[PDB]
Write a protein that binds this DNA or RNA. Structure first.
Lengths: 209, 44, 51, 97, 82, 276
DNA sequence: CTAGTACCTAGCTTAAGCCTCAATAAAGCTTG
């Protein structure tokens, strides 16, 4: 049982790289859309006791505007990751000048680690993801419309144009898959471009709470 | 586990009572005698 | 079902901003029917340039 | 009444000739209030004791007399729902009754 | 808001048309001076309809925006639907 | 074959009152490529989705007291040629479901060994004899433990397929919308009739995360599950589709104004605001 | 003695509170 796991890890990597491209981090097209054969030749076809193992298959990327803020992703070998198995990642967080990273766990993360990720969030804004959850890019689905993250100046422009306060907008909870996919705090509205069967295109704005 | 136990909730009784306990309380000490009143042909 | 639907939407209306807001001015739609148009003055039509 | 379980309200197959299929109120009592067919008659009840003495004298055995050895091949007699005894020959007792 | 900044529709909606007509014909019923020369009709509702058609109703409409502001639209100044 | 989709007023209730447990949760899984074109690969995808316990494949189960594994109280030369507890377990499968779902004794044995570890050894007959036997021992609360583990292994083992999806149907759709639609080189639409498959359970996440399954078009008819998997905006569109499905099923028409307003006010707060 | 009348005493569903079970860090041995 290694072809299935290699295919699973390849799709996880592809979805994570697409996630980084959508989030704004700098990724080349070659890594953006590579076939399964490139992953095989570059990692090794043998996830069970072989060279395509986690931890040195992890990805680091940087934002387009400035290569100062950087975003790692981490695939722990442990199914149920724990504090001692994320404090190492936090030590890497500190020893680098990096600010935020991802953790794609194998099984459900422990509540103690979840509470930690809550606790050092202001210093290090890092979040988690599931092995199961990242085998498909949900934005590619037909039901999910085009979500665009607004910057603060255009948020203020929107509010001044419509003469409405921040809480009167339609809102979106930070825990739902699209907002977690992009990676966005509360008080940050998202452009949502969807086709209207009545009049063409319709633009709606969801705020994170 | 074992599965498919038979209970008999009884009037003026708060909880269900297994039927074999009901028969033993009714007066049948043995087990063959109790089974003679439920399964009428032992070859099944 | 009808009463329950009505009690959930009974204060949703089109304001003079032409947007659609509930009783507490929370925006539901920026334009009514995401076009700003009345439902009683529309017709069925065919898009000739399609297919 | 006012219950969403329509199964009790439905016209059952065993209503043939004892309950009028057509006649029922159209309100919230559909199928719950049903009238009586023309020749349909409701039994008034009588003592089963004469039936008991008649039964106990042909070839049947009360529960206390027999052992459950011979109870599987014979037939169980119920009178007003109480298990009265056991008979070896169902036929020619049905005809007798 | 000032006369320069008017963002509401220039069309007199059906609700404004109903309520203005009602509240003007009520005034005519209470012997308010008519703004249009009548030809002997006695019904205040028809008198108010004639005034609306002639664009002479001495009433303006305060349209409250959702934010709290308002606009003062004169009945003579916005387009009547019918 | 699966028109227990509970349309009408019950579906309207299940949508308005957003219920965690709909009466008929079902998928509309589409297929990606050549599997969508031919029936054999569609069946191969079907068997990987339809949940299968070891009850589905076995004919009968029996336990014996063989003093010696070498003794072979049951006359089976396969065990003679193949060959520590005396109380063993024996289950007989059938060829019908076995070859319907394309399993092997090796796969079943490795599933047992992975689920239970090296607490037991499975001795399976080869796929040559007419009879389908695998024997179970326990390596070294003596036999009732074996009875309980037999019950547990029959109840839930997931030999093939994924949990909570009990039965999956397979058919070629006739309606154009459910059929795949493309655009040719001359700008036509060329309604394609490819294989699709509908279920009677719902996962929406272990399904799309499967090879040869189209993760772009698979709707799940379950509003709460869509909320958990795709997000609130996809919920609005799917809820609109399911709410329009019941209204347009009668052939009647309701203007999109009202459906859009209802699906907006039900989802304008970021969570599923059921109308109760 | 008794009477008349005046005063005393069928199913649903969904949240929501309540019952048990598995990681986990302090607390203290434990031997390296």
């Amino acid at each position: 049982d290694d072809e299935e796991e290699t295919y699973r890890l390849w799709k996880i990597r592809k979805t994570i790289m697409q996630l980084c491209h959508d989030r704004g981090y700098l990724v080349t097209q070659d890594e953006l859309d590579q076939t399964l054969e490139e992953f095989k030749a570059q990692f090794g076809d043998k996830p069970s006791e072989g060279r395509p193992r986690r931890t040195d298959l992890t990805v680091l990327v940087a934002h387009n505007d400035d290569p100062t803020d950087q975003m790692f992703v981490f695939f722990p070998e442990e199914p149920k990751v724990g504090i001692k198995t994320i404090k190492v990642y936090c030590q890497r967080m500190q020893e680098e000048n990096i600010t935020r990273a991802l953790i794609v766990v194998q099984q459900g993360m422990t509540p103690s680690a979840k509470q930690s990720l809550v606790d050092m969030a202001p210093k290090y804004i890092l979040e988690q993801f599931l092995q199961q959850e990242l085998l498909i890019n949900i934005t590619e689905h037909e039901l999910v419309p085009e979500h665009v993250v607004m910057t603060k100046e255009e948020v203020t422009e929107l509010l001044a144009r419509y003469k409405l306060r921040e809480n009167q907008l339609p809102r979106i909870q930070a825990g739902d898959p699209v907002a977690r996919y992009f990676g966005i705090k509360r008080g940050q509205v998202v452009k949502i471009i969807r086709p209207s069967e009545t009049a063409g295109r319709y633009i709606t704005y969801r705020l994170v709470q | 586990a074992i599965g498919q136990r038979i209970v008999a909730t009884l009037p003026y009784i708060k909880q269900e009572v297994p039927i074999i306990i009901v028969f033993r309380a009714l007066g049948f000490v043995s087990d063959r005698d109790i089974l003679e009143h439920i399964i009428y042909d032992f070859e099944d | 079902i009808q009463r329950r639907l009505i009690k959930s939407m009974e204060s949703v209306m089109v304001k003079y901003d032409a947007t659609v807001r509930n009783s507490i001015n929370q925006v539901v739609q920026l334009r009514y029917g995401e076009d700003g148009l009345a439902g009683e003055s529309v017709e069925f039509q065919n898009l000739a340039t399609l297919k | 009444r006012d219950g969403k379980l329509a199964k009790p309200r439905q016209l059952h197959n065993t209503l043939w000739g004892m309950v009028c299929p057509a006649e029922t109120p159209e309100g919230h009592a559909v199928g719950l209030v049903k009238n009586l067919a023309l020749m349909a008659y409701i039994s008034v009840g009588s003592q089963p004791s004469p039936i008991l003495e008649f039964l106990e004298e042909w070839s049947m055995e009360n529960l206390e007399e027999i052992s459950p050895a011979a109870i599987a091949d014979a037939t169980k007699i119920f009178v007003n729902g109480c298990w009265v005894g056991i008979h070896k020959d169902p036929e020619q007792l049905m005809n007798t009754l | 808001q000032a006369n320069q900044k008017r963002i509401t529709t220039p069309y007199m909606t059906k609700y404004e048309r109903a309520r203005v007509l009602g509240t003007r014909a009520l005034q005519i019923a209470m012997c308010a001076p008519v703004m249009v020369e009548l030809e002997g009709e006695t019904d205040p509702l028809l008198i108010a309809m004639k005034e609306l058609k002639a664009r002479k109703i001495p009433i303006i409409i305060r349209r409250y925006l959702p934010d709290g502001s308002y606009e003062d639209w004169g009945v003579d100044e916005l387009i009547i639907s019918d | 074959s699966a028109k227990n989709v509970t349309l009408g007023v019950p579906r309207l209730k299940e949508l308005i009152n957003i219920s965690k447990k709909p009466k008929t949760p079902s998928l509309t899984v589409f297929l990606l490529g050549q599997s969508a074109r031919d029936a054999e690969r569609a069946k191969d995808i079907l068997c990987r989705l339809e949940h299968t316990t070891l009850r589905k494949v076995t004919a009968n189960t029996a336990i014996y007291y063989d003093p010696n594994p070498q003794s072979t109280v049951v006359a089976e030369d396969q065990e003679w040629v193949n060959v520590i507890s005396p109380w063993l377990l024996r289950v007989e499968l059938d060829r019908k479901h076995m070859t319907d779902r394309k399993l092997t004794m090796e796969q079943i044995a490795e599933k047992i060994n992975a689920g239970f570890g090296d607490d037991l050894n499975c001795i399976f007959n080869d796929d040559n004899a007419e009879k389908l036997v695998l024997r179970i021992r326990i390596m070294n609360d003596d036999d009732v433990f074996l009875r309980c583990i037999e019950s547990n292994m029959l109840t839930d083992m997931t030999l093939q397929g994924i949990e909570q999806i009990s039965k999956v149907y397979m058919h070629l759709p006739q309606t154009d919308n459910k059929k795949k639609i493309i655009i040719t080189e001359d700008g036509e639409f060329k309604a394609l009739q490819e294989w699709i498959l509908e279920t009677d359970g719902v996962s929406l996440m272990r399904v799309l995360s499967e090879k040869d399954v189209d993760p772009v078009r698979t709707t799940s008819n379950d509003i709460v599950e869509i909320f958990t998997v795709l997000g609130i905006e996809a919920v609005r569109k799917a809820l609109e589709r399911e709410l329009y499905h019941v209204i347009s099923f009668d052939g009647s028409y309701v203007n999109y104004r009202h459906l859009a307003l209802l699906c907006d006010t039900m989802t304008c707060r970021g969570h599923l605001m059921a109308i109760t």
